[PDB]
Design a protein around this ligand. Structure first.
Ligand code: CA
Ligand code: CA
Ligand code: CA
Ligand code: CA
Length: 174
């Protein structure tokens, strides 16, 4: 499937152009030409102030997932478009689940462990105490098919099918 290497067609032409105008506001005046702006790398601090990210519980993590920089320390305009495409209401549930999973996998090991799931739950929530353990045990009980103690992507889709609340995280996070 290789979502990252797909050319996503979720944004309209106007959205693309408007995104470019907003991206250019983060650049020095001299880098705002079309050609200069598409070579630019914008550090996360400027991206993190945007309305799409400022109050996002996983904002630092979202920056890292969409950055195509090998240092994972900035977004190009194209990374920013990728971001807005996945965030759009038009983005398909399969694309959103893919990227939500990546976001929630903090160590990028390919699974959601007890810590990964804890942050997810906190994001929905006066937080839970050590009743967080109770909750996580029941998710694994239902959806940890290979019984490895973690939740992989397939199992994640099961959880999403089971829980309106976890499914609502897609609107919160993307
Ligand atoms: Ca690309
Ligand atoms: Ca959205
Ligand atoms: Ca993980
Ligand atoms: Ca598992």
């Amino acid at each position: 499937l290789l979502a990252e290497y797909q050319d996503l067609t979720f944004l309209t032409k106007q959205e693309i152009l408007l995104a470019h105008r907003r991206f250019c506001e983060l650049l020095p005046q001299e880098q705002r030409s079309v050609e200069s702006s598409l070579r630019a790398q914008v550090p996360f601090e400027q991206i993190l102030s945007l309305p799409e990210l400022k109050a996002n519980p996983f904002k630092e993590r979202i920056c890292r997932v969409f950055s195509t920089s090998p240092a994972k320390d900035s977004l190009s305009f194209e990374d920013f478009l990728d971001l807005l495409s996945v965030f759009s209401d038009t983005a398909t549930p399969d694309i959103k689940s893919h990227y939500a999973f990546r976001i929630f996998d903090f160590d990028d090991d390919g699974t959601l462990n007890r810590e990964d799931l804890s942050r997810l739950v906190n994001c929905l929530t006066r937080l839970s105490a050590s009743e967080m353990k109770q909750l996580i045990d029941n998710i694994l009980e239902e959806s940890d098919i290979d019984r490895d103690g973690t939740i992989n992507l397939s199992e994640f889709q099961h959880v999403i099918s089971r829980s309106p609340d976890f499914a609502s995280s897609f609107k919160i996070v993307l």
